[PDB]
Amino acid sequence: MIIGNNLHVDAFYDEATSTISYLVMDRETRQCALIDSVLDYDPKSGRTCSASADRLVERVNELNASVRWVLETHVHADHLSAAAYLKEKLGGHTAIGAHITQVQKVFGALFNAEPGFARDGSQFDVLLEDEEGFRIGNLQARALHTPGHTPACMSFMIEDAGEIAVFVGDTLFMPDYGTARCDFPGADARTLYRSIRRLLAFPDQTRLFMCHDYLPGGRDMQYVTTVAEQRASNIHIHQGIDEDSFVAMREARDKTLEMPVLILPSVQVNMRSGQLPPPEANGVSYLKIPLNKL
């Protein structure tokens, strides 16, 4: 897609985790950003693979690009982040919400992390705050704090000409599927409602890019929608739904949800900015799986 004049957006879909990754480039400077990259991982054998990550490396080189930002909307609990691998091969700066510290505090205790594990977000280059601006070449971008799914959820808006594109993360899905879950630690259905209403306050022709697409059909994969479409036909939080009705709906639905397959391996890796836990005496890195907790 090309929004406005110089906003270039490439979408990448991982069927295994239903995760949509993004390559966002300024066409004027050929300088780009990578959002929510997927690190392939098999829970059975405990083996990683940069198969999907290399799809981004090829796309960058094909466009003669230059990575400036490696972004993450939130601490993913459904897949492993490939932010560290991409920074090691394409360079740039990693960035995540400032409230990563709250997440690191909780799961730092759940996994009984080694004393060397930082709870200040030292693993991430830049800690973004609400309404904070940052530059992708000539493209003016802003980081928006939109909690609900997690306490540290951020949304990235990028402007070119008069048109706006917002990368919302795990807040809104396609209008036919609804919204994200709020059964994770720190999550809140009432907070999510407010973050979305604030998101839908944007101009109605604002393009919204999704983090997941579970395909309610039937239909193929879709990643882009508009504010006007969401306000009119979202099955969970369209314009007719007030705060109280959403919360009762959202909370009742979360109780009927199963845990993500890779939630325990994902968080302990994504809280380290995509770094594997440090090797033990035998030089082997291990993922700690808490028993009968969570």
Next chain:
Amino acid sequence: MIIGNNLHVDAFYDEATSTISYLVMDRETRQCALIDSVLDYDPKSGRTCSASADRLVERVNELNASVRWVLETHVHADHLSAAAYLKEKLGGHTAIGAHITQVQKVFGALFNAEPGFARDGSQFDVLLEDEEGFRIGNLQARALHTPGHTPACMSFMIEDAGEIAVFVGDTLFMPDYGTARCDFPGADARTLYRSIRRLLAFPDQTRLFMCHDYLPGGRDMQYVTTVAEQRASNIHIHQGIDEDSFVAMREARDKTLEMPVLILPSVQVNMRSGQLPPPEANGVSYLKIPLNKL
């Protein structure tokens, strides 16, 4: 099912792992043994459950029976053993093959076991040897060393009158499915062939009890067959199959197999006689998952 006159056998099926558990009771003395019990485990949330195990508990009380043995044919790599739970609930003695020490040495290193983990099979009450006899009430049983799937695989032979019943474990499946795999560390296809031939040297009327039934197509669960049926129609190792021809078949097939879903959490638990890893300082037990080492 009743073999001979005083041999009572109850089969139990776990849909998730296709595992077949057994309750073997002596009718006269009303004493019994439990073979390959399953401890329900959810890898997504790290939650254990004794729903299947309690089905064994209430079945014993229904028969007003007494548990003397809690057996395991080998260290399972597809499910968690519920031997410890059943021993704390029903009593008795746990027993396993003497070559448990070999698999505790290898996986004791793979999972980097904490200082205190015994690699001599000390966690098990009795270490069984080849052709060693033991008693379930008045029933004379005998343990046979039948490796190939694992270096410590045992088959349990029990006599009544008259007729012979053998619990082969993971060696022979139903004749329409063939044999077990030999890609697991310590396994060998040629030696498995030899173990099976020993088993098929028994009288043709001898009943064989399987450890798994993966349902080729859809024909309901089947756990019992005969030596004559296996010798005549086993798709992998019937009478007309030479040793060299089997090894080439078996080793080629194992290269086309994925790891079991629960292979990493099961082994590190089953090598502790069904006991979970000792809690850390925060009072939480953790399963170590080795990364890129399998």
